[PDB]
Design a protein around this ligand. Structure first.
Ligand code: MG
Ligand code: ZN
Ligand code: ZN
Ligand code: ZN
Lengths: 55, 290, 143, 56
RNA sequence: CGGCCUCCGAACGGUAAGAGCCUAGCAUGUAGAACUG
């Protein structure tokens, strides 16, 4: 019925390397500093826009 | 709509086996008369007999008390026209569409005030059972009610299905026999029923005691007594029926004469005894003396 | 051309001798499949398919169990490639069911009362022999 | 349990019915019509099982 | 060293309403079928 997979790390590392081009090359959260949810929630609640963010 | 327990129809229409196979389909069809949607039951009456189906509204069937699938009465099995006319019944069955819907509705409300034992309305208060209708009943089961149809294929020769044909591989009745045109409405209302009309010509061919001329001839001639008939026994036979004016049992004739003091007594007695008088198992014949 | 095969790997080495009968049966099933719906009937137009299906599967049941002339790996491969029928075989394993007409004729839900169809009843129980072609298969007394 | 049929059973059924104009079927007519109400479910089930370009 | 980029189309609302006749369609696949000394 195909739920619940279990892999080893050689598998997971090869999978990672193949998927390398569809993925994001950052390791932390400091990139999304003023671009995360709570930043966009606050921006929306105050009706002000972030340079690259939604209105 | 109706949602019920089981169908009421002639045991002939039920079939031969003591165990029945009946499948229930809720709101399966609309009455051929009432058009009220009612739960239909299907039964296999016998091996190689056509499967029977409940064929009329439960209310429409409780009204007129017939085989809710065979269309024949539940008591003797007589068609509506014949049974009613022999019971001396002139019923006002609805034929209008709007009055028919309203009538079947009100009759379902009346059957709702009824308790499931006696046929609702006037259909019961004529319960003087008529010997003409009794003798018109088929006393043995007519399981021909379930004989299959004709297969047009074998009727032209074409039924290559083998015995698996769902129709009887018999020469078709050339339609002209009026026994072929009994629409559900005709057979239900009992109007223009030519099978029952042939039954009526039969009932006109059925022998009763025709009355003689002389209004003083109250002499009823009894034939077929034997030597085991007693004078007092025949007196007890014709006793409550009125005044027996004289008894004359001719042993050398195996006959007798009952003279009556009431012309009504003599007539009604002879008519009640015609071909039905059974004393000591003897087939006694009533006649009017000369 | 063949039953174009999804497994992409080599069929095992006993496959080429079961080949010809299998194929001819397959082209046969295609012909019985194409036989078109004339005054034939509707309920009777699926009977040839259950014939040829029973036949395919009875063949591979022979060439495994009755003769012991096929490897079990080739066997499971011929299961997977649609030449065989898993559940037909799995019933045929049982006792009373040697000649099962098809898998449906024992499916009780397909009837009103939850019983097998008369196809299953032995001929001795009737003792009258009115010929019966089961609606589902068209079979005449499988068992 | 319920056991599965060979594909030619359905393939033949559908091929036979073709497009329901032949008079032979003519009761399917109304059941065929009644199955319309479930047609947006068949489409959803079809499209979410699409075959994924690395498969043939 | 800041950036700021809508809108996309369809139905009704106008060209009448009928009474009739004619003729394929369309529904059923029915029920039940004889009686004597
Ligand atoms: Mg207007
Ligand atoms: Zn069988
Ligand atoms: Zn069967
Ligand atoms: Zn079968």
């Amino acid at each position: 019925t195909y739920q619940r997979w279990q892999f080893t790390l050689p598998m997971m590392s090869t999978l990672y390397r193949l998927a390398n081009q569809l993925l994001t090359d950052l390791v932390d959260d400091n990139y999304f500093y003023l671009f995360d949810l709570k930043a966009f929630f606050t921006s929306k609640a105050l009706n002000m826009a972030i340079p690259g963010g939604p209105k | 709509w109706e949602d019920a327990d089981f169908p009421i129809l002639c045991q002939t229409c039920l079939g031969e086996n003591p165990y029945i196979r009946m499948t229930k389909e809720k709101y399966g069809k609309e009455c051929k008369i009432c058009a009220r949607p009612f739960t239909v039951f299907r039964w296999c009456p016998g091996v190689r007999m056509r499967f029977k189906k409940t064929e009329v509204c439960q209310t429409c069937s409780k009204l007129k008390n017939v085989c809710q699938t065979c269309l024949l009465d539940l008591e003797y099995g007589l068609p509506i026209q014949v049974r009613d006319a022999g019971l001396s019944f002139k019923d006002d069955m609805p034929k209008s569409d709007v009055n028919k819907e309203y009538y079947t509705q009100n009759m379902e409300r009346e059957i709702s005030n009824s308790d499931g034992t006696r046929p609702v309305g006037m259909l019961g208060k004529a319960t003087s059972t008529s010997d003409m209708l009794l003798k018109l009943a088929r006393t043995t089961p007519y399981y021909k009610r379930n004989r299959p149809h004709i297969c047009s294929f074998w009727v032209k020769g074409e039924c290559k299905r083998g015995e698996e044909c769902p129709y009887r591989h018999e020469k078709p009745t050339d339609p002209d026999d009026p026994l072929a045109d009994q629409n559900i409405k005709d057979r239900y209302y009992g109007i223009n029923d030519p099978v029952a009309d042939k039954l009526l010509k039969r009932a006109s061919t059925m022998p009763r005691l025709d009355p003689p001329e002389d209004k003083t001839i109250t002499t009823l001639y009894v034939g077929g007594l034997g030597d085991t008939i007693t004078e007092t026994d025949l007196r007890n036979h014709f006793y409550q029926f009125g005044e027996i004016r004289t008894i004359t049992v001719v042993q050398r004739q195996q006959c007798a004469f009952i003279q009556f003091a009431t012309r009504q007594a003599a007539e009604v007695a002879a008519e009640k005894s015609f071909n039905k008088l059974i004393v000591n198992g003897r087939r006694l014949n009533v006649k009017w003396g000369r | 051309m063949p039953k174009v095969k999804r497994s992409r790997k080599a069929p095992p080495d006993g496959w080429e001798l079961i080949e010809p009968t299998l194929d001819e049966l397959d082209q046969k099933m295609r012909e019985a499949e194409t036989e078109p719906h004339e005054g034939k009937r509707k309920v009777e137009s699926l009977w040839p398919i259950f014939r040829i299906h029973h036949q395919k599967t009875r063949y591979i049941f022979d060439l495994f169990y009755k003769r012991k002339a096929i490897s079990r790996e080739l066997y499971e491969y011929c299961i997977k490639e649609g030449y065989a029928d898993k559940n037909l075989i799995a019933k045929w394993k049982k006792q009373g069911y040697e000649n099962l007409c098809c898998l449906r004729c024992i499916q009780t839900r397909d009837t009103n009362f939850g019983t097998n169809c008369i196809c299953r009843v032995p001929k001795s129980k009737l003792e009258v022999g009115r010929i019966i072609e089961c609606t589902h298969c068209g079979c005449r007394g499988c068992s | 349990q319920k056991e599965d049929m060979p594909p030619e059973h359905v393939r033949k059924i559908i091929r036979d019915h073709g497009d329901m104009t032949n008079r032979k079927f003519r009761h399917d007519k109304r059941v065929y019509l009644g199955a319309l109400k479930y047609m947006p479910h068949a489409v959803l089930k079809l499209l979410e099982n699409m075959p994924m370009p690395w498969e043939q």
